[PDB]
From a paper:
FARP1 (FERM, RhoGEF and pleckstrin domain-containing protein 1) and its close homolog FARP2 were identified as guanine nucleotide exchange factors (GEFs) for RhoGTPases that play regulatory roles in neuronal development. FARP1 and FARP2 share a conserved domain architecture, containing a N-terminal 4.1, ezrin, radixin and moesin (FERM) domain, which is followed by a long linker (~200 residues) that connects to a Dbl-homology (DH) domain and two pleckstrin homology (PH) domains. As expected from their high degree of sequence identity (>60%), the structures of these FERM domains are very similar to one another, with root mean square deviations within 1.0 Å.
FARP2 also interacts with PlexinA family members, contributing to both Plexin-mediated repulsive axon guidance and dendritic development. The corresponding site in the FERM domains of FARP1 and FARP2 contains a negatively charged residue (Asp97, Glu100 and Asp107 in zfFARP1, mFARP2 and zfFARP2, respectively), suggesting that it cannot serve as a phosphatidylinositol binding site in these FERM domains. Overall, the surface of these FERM domains show highly polarized surface electrostatic potential, with one side positively charged while the opposite side negatively charged. The first arginine residue in the KRKR motif (Arg277) in the FERM domain of mFARP2 makes a salt bridge with Asp216 from the neighboring protomer in the linear array. The linear packing of the FERM domains of mFARP2 and zfFARP2 in our crystal structures suggest a potential mechanism for the oligomerization of these FERM domains. We speculate that the oligomerization, if occurs in the cell, could be a mechanism for regulating membrane targeting of FARP1 and FARP2.
Author numbering: 37 to 322
Write the structure that this text describes.
Amino acid sequence: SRMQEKHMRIRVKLLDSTVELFDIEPKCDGQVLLTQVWKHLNLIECDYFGLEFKNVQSYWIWLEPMKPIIRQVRKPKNAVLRLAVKFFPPDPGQLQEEYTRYLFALQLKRDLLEERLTCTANTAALLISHLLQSEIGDYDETLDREHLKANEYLPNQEKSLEKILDFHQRHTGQTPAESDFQVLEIARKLEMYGIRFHMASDREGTKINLAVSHMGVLVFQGTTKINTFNWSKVRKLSFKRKRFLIKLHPEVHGPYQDTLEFLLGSRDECKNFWKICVEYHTFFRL
Protein backbone atom coordinates (compact mmCIF):
# COMPACT_ATOMS: atom_id res chain seq x y z
CA SER A 1 0.00 0.00 0.00
CA ARG A 2 0.98 3.60 -0.72
CA MET A 3 0.45 6.72 1.41
CA GLN A 4 1.33 8.92 -1.58
CA GLU A 5 -0.42 9.42 -4.90
CA LYS A 6 0.94 7.44 -7.84
CA HIS A 7 3.90 9.34 -9.30
CA MET A 8 4.42 10.30 -12.93
CA ARG A 9 7.80 9.58 -14.57
CA ILE A 10 9.31 12.70 -16.06
CA ARG A 11 12.34 12.63 -18.36
CA VAL A 12 14.58 15.67 -17.96
CA LYS A 13 17.03 16.30 -20.78
CA LEU A 14 20.05 18.09 -19.30
CA LEU A 15 22.32 20.61 -21.03
CA ASP A 16 24.98 17.96 -21.75
CA SER A 17 22.24 15.91 -23.49
CA THR A 18 22.14 13.24 -20.79
CA VAL A 19 18.68 12.30 -19.50
CA GLU A 20 17.67 11.97 -15.85
CA LEU A 21 14.38 10.46 -14.67
CA PHE A 22 12.30 12.10 -11.93
CA ASP A 23 9.24 10.57 -10.30
CA ILE A 24 6.77 13.10 -8.96
CA GLU A 25 3.14 13.38 -7.89
CA PRO A 26 1.28 15.01 -10.79
CA LYS A 27 -0.48 17.40 -8.39
CA CYS A 28 2.79 18.89 -7.12
CA ASP A 29 3.63 22.45 -8.13
CA GLY A 30 6.41 22.83 -10.70
CA GLN A 31 8.82 24.00 -7.99
CA VAL A 32 8.99 20.46 -6.58
CA LEU A 33 10.48 19.18 -9.85
CA LEU A 34 12.65 22.26 -10.32
CA THR A 35 14.18 21.76 -6.86
CA GLN A 36 14.81 18.03 -7.44
CA VAL A 37 16.66 19.01 -10.61
CA TRP A 38 18.69 21.74 -8.89
CA LYS A 39 19.65 19.16 -6.25
CA HIS A 40 20.60 16.48 -8.74
CA LEU A 41 22.87 19.09 -10.36
CA ASN A 42 24.00 20.90 -7.23
CA LEU A 43 23.11 24.08 -9.09
CA ILE A 44 23.57 27.05 -6.75
CA GLU A 45 22.79 29.82 -9.23
CA CYS A 46 19.57 28.07 -10.19
CA ASP A 47 17.58 31.33 -10.47
CA TYR A 48 18.94 31.78 -14.01
CA PHE A 49 17.45 28.49 -15.15
CA GLY A 50 14.19 26.75 -15.95
CA LEU A 51 12.70 23.63 -17.49
CA GLU A 52 10.94 23.86 -20.82
CA PHE A 53 8.79 21.57 -22.93
CA LYS A 54 7.63 21.66 -26.53
CA ASN A 55 3.89 22.00 -27.09
CA VAL A 56 1.78 20.56 -29.91
CA GLN A 57 2.20 23.87 -31.72
CA SER A 58 5.89 22.98 -31.58
CA TYR A 59 7.00 26.03 -29.58
CA TRP A 60 8.87 25.93 -26.26
CA ILE A 61 7.11 26.82 -23.03
CA TRP A 62 8.46 27.23 -19.48
CA LEU A 63 7.38 25.10 -16.54
CA GLU A 64 5.62 27.36 -14.02
CA PRO A 65 6.80 26.88 -10.42
CA MET A 66 3.44 27.64 -8.74
CA LYS A 67 1.11 25.51 -10.85
CA PRO A 68 0.56 21.73 -10.70
CA ILE A 69 2.81 19.85 -13.12
CA ILE A 70 0.15 17.57 -14.56
CA ARG A 71 -1.98 20.58 -15.59
CA GLN A 72 0.99 21.94 -17.57
CA VAL A 73 2.49 18.86 -19.19
CA ARG A 74 -0.62 16.64 -19.63
CA LYS A 75 1.27 13.46 -20.55
CA PRO A 76 1.11 11.17 -17.50
CA LYS A 77 3.02 8.39 -19.25
CA ASN A 78 5.93 10.31 -20.79
CA ALA A 79 6.42 13.92 -19.89
CA VAL A 80 9.72 15.24 -21.27
CA LEU A 81 11.27 18.56 -20.29
CA ARG A 82 14.70 20.05 -20.83
CA LEU A 83 17.02 22.21 -18.76
CA ALA A 84 17.64 25.67 -20.21
CA VAL A 85 18.88 29.11 -19.28
CA LYS A 86 15.84 31.37 -18.79
CA PHE A 87 17.59 34.65 -17.98
CA PHE A 88 20.65 35.74 -19.99
CA PRO A 89 22.65 38.41 -18.12
CA PRO A 90 24.92 40.82 -20.02
CA ASP A 91 28.15 39.46 -18.41
CA PRO A 92 27.80 35.72 -17.80
CA GLY A 93 31.56 35.49 -17.23
CA GLN A 94 30.74 37.21 -13.93
CA LEU A 95 28.49 34.37 -12.74
CA GLN A 96 29.78 33.21 -9.34
CA GLU A 97 30.47 29.53 -10.05
CA GLU A 98 32.56 27.78 -12.66
CA TYR A 99 29.73 25.23 -12.88
CA THR A 100 27.19 27.89 -13.86
CA ARG A 101 29.55 29.22 -16.52
CA TYR A 102 29.94 25.65 -17.78
CA LEU A 103 26.14 25.31 -18.09
CA PHE A 104 25.94 28.65 -19.92
CA ALA A 105 28.58 27.51 -22.42
CA LEU A 106 26.51 24.34 -23.01
CA GLN A 107 23.40 26.47 -23.52
CA LEU A 108 25.17 28.63 -26.08
CA LYS A 109 26.43 25.47 -27.78
CA ARG A 110 22.80 24.32 -28.04
CA ASP A 111 21.64 27.72 -29.36
CA LEU A 112 24.33 27.58 -32.04
CA LEU A 113 23.33 24.03 -33.06
CA GLU A 114 19.63 24.94 -33.10
CA GLU A 115 20.37 28.02 -35.26
CA ARG A 116 19.11 30.46 -32.63
CA LEU A 117 22.50 32.02 -31.99
CA THR A 118 23.61 33.36 -35.35
CA CYS A 119 26.90 35.08 -36.18
CA THR A 120 29.53 35.29 -38.90
CA ALA A 121 31.12 32.11 -40.23
CA ASN A 122 34.49 32.80 -38.61
CA THR A 123 32.87 33.61 -35.30
CA ALA A 124 30.84 30.40 -35.30
CA ALA A 125 34.00 28.45 -36.08
CA LEU A 126 35.84 30.24 -33.28
CA LEU A 127 33.07 29.44 -30.78
CA ILE A 128 33.13 25.77 -31.77
CA SER A 129 36.93 25.69 -31.50
CA HIS A 130 36.69 26.77 -27.85
CA LEU A 131 33.94 24.24 -27.22
CA LEU A 132 36.30 21.57 -28.61
CA GLN A 133 39.09 22.76 -26.33
CA SER A 134 36.81 22.43 -23.30
CA GLU A 135 35.50 18.98 -24.19
CA ILE A 136 38.33 17.09 -25.89
CA GLY A 137 41.33 19.29 -25.05
CA ASP A 138 44.33 20.19 -27.20
CA TYR A 139 44.05 20.00 -30.96
CA ASP A 140 44.91 16.87 -32.84
CA GLU A 141 43.74 16.53 -36.42
CA THR A 142 42.48 12.97 -36.09
CA LEU A 143 40.89 13.47 -32.67
CA ASP A 144 39.08 16.62 -33.86
CA ARG A 145 37.80 15.05 -37.09
CA GLU A 146 36.52 11.92 -35.37
CA HIS A 147 34.84 13.99 -32.67
CA LEU A 148 33.19 16.28 -35.23
CA LYS A 149 31.88 13.26 -37.11
CA ALA A 150 30.08 11.92 -34.05
CA ASN A 151 29.08 15.24 -32.45
CA GLU A 152 27.05 18.00 -34.08
CA TYR A 153 27.76 21.67 -33.37
CA LEU A 154 26.13 23.25 -36.44
CA PRO A 155 24.11 22.01 -39.39
CA ASN A 156 26.48 21.56 -42.32
CA GLN A 157 29.40 22.03 -39.94
CA GLU A 158 31.59 20.28 -42.51
CA LYS A 159 31.64 23.57 -44.44
CA SER A 160 33.57 25.15 -41.59
CA LEU A 161 35.78 22.20 -40.64
CA GLU A 162 39.02 23.84 -41.82
CA LYS A 163 38.33 27.07 -39.94
CA ILE A 164 37.37 25.15 -36.79
CA LEU A 165 40.61 23.12 -36.83
CA ASP A 166 42.67 26.21 -37.60
CA PHE A 167 41.30 28.12 -34.60
CA HIS A 168 41.50 25.10 -32.27
CA GLN A 169 45.25 24.85 -32.90
CA ARG A 170 45.57 28.27 -31.26
CA HIS A 171 44.13 27.13 -27.91
CA THR A 172 47.00 24.89 -26.83
CA GLY A 173 46.96 24.22 -23.09
CA GLN A 174 43.74 26.07 -22.26
CA THR A 175 41.63 24.58 -19.49
CA PRO A 176 37.91 23.80 -19.73
CA ALA A 177 37.13 26.82 -17.48
CA GLU A 178 39.22 29.12 -19.67
CA SER A 179 37.53 27.73 -22.76
CA ASP A 180 34.04 28.24 -21.33
CA PHE A 181 34.99 31.80 -20.41
CA GLN A 182 36.01 32.50 -23.98
CA VAL A 183 32.73 31.07 -25.29
CA LEU A 184 30.84 33.43 -22.96
CA GLU A 185 33.02 36.39 -23.92
CA ILE A 186 32.48 35.86 -27.64
CA ALA A 187 28.76 35.07 -27.34
CA ARG A 188 27.74 37.90 -25.03
CA LYS A 189 28.59 40.50 -27.68
CA LEU A 190 26.43 38.85 -30.35
CA GLU A 191 23.18 40.59 -31.21
CA MET A 192 21.43 37.22 -30.97
CA TYR A 193 22.82 36.35 -27.50
CA GLY A 194 19.90 35.03 -25.43
CA ILE A 195 17.39 35.94 -28.15
CA ARG A 196 14.21 33.95 -28.86
CA PHE A 197 11.78 35.33 -31.45
CA HIS A 198 8.03 35.57 -31.02
CA MET A 199 6.32 36.34 -34.32
CA ALA A 200 3.99 39.33 -34.41
CA SER A 201 2.68 42.20 -36.50
CA ASP A 202 2.70 45.93 -35.70
CA ARG A 203 0.07 48.66 -36.18
CA GLU A 204 0.83 48.92 -39.91
CA GLY A 205 0.60 45.14 -40.31
CA THR A 206 4.34 44.67 -40.80
CA LYS A 207 5.56 41.23 -39.76
CA ILE A 208 8.16 41.54 -36.99
CA ASN A 209 9.88 39.42 -34.37
CA LEU A 210 9.44 40.32 -30.70
CA ALA A 211 12.06 39.45 -28.12
CA VAL A 212 13.09 40.37 -24.60
CA SER A 213 16.49 40.88 -22.98
CA HIS A 214 18.12 42.29 -19.85
CA MET A 215 17.83 45.68 -21.59
CA GLY A 216 14.13 45.67 -22.43
CA VAL A 217 11.60 44.60 -25.02
CA LEU A 218 13.01 44.25 -28.49
CA VAL A 219 11.67 44.45 -32.04
CA PHE A 220 13.35 42.77 -35.00
CA GLN A 221 12.25 42.97 -38.61
CA GLY A 222 13.35 39.66 -40.00
CA THR A 223 16.80 39.33 -38.43
CA THR A 224 17.38 43.07 -38.13
CA LYS A 225 16.85 44.81 -34.79
CA ILE A 226 14.71 47.88 -35.29
CA ASN A 227 13.70 48.92 -31.74
CA THR A 228 14.78 48.61 -28.14
CA PHE A 229 12.20 49.59 -25.55
CA ASN A 230 14.52 49.98 -22.58
CA TRP A 231 13.10 49.02 -19.19
CA SER A 232 13.54 52.57 -17.93
CA LYS A 233 10.96 53.73 -20.50
CA VAL A 234 8.46 50.93 -19.95
CA ARG A 235 5.63 51.86 -17.59
CA LYS A 236 3.49 48.74 -17.98
CA LEU A 237 3.17 45.51 -19.95
CA SER A 238 -0.28 44.06 -20.63
CA PHE A 239 -1.97 41.62 -22.95
CA LYS A 240 -5.52 41.16 -24.23
CA ARG A 241 -6.30 38.09 -26.31
CA LYS A 242 -3.79 38.20 -29.21
CA ARG A 243 -2.70 41.79 -28.46
CA PHE A 244 0.53 42.62 -26.61
CA LEU A 245 0.53 46.13 -25.09
CA ILE A 246 3.57 48.16 -24.06
CA LYS A 247 2.93 51.40 -22.15
CA LEU A 248 5.92 53.65 -22.89
CA HIS A 249 7.07 57.27 -23.21
CA PRO A 250 4.45 59.10 -25.33
CA GLU A 251 5.03 60.18 -28.93
CA VAL A 252 6.01 63.84 -29.32
CA HIS A 253 4.36 64.77 -32.61
CA GLY A 254 0.82 63.44 -32.38
CA PRO A 255 -2.28 63.24 -30.19
CA TYR A 256 -1.12 61.84 -26.89
CA GLN A 257 -0.34 58.13 -27.25
CA ASP A 258 1.56 56.15 -24.63
CA THR A 259 0.88 52.59 -25.80
CA LEU A 260 2.26 50.43 -28.60
CA GLU A 261 0.36 47.34 -29.73
CA PHE A 262 1.60 44.15 -31.38
CA LEU A 263 -0.52 41.25 -32.59
CA LEU A 264 0.79 37.74 -31.93
CA GLY A 265 -0.45 34.51 -33.48
CA SER A 266 -2.73 33.39 -30.66
CA ARG A 267 -3.92 34.32 -27.19
CA ASP A 268 -1.62 31.77 -25.59
CA GLU A 269 1.45 32.86 -27.59
CA CYS A 270 0.68 36.43 -26.60
CA LYS A 271 0.24 35.43 -22.94
CA ASN A 272 3.48 33.47 -22.96
CA PHE A 273 5.44 36.42 -24.37
CA TRP A 274 3.87 38.74 -21.81
CA LYS A 275 4.86 36.33 -19.03
CA ILE A 276 8.53 36.12 -20.05
CA CYS A 277 8.71 39.91 -20.40
CA VAL A 278 7.28 40.48 -16.94
CA GLU A 279 9.69 37.89 -15.54
CA TYR A 280 12.68 39.54 -17.27
CA HIS A 281 11.73 42.92 -15.91
CA THR A 282 11.43 41.53 -12.38
CA PHE A 283 14.74 39.64 -12.67
CA PHE A 284 16.85 42.46 -14.09
CA ARG A 285 15.17 45.55 -12.64
CA LEU A 286 14.57 46.84 -9.12
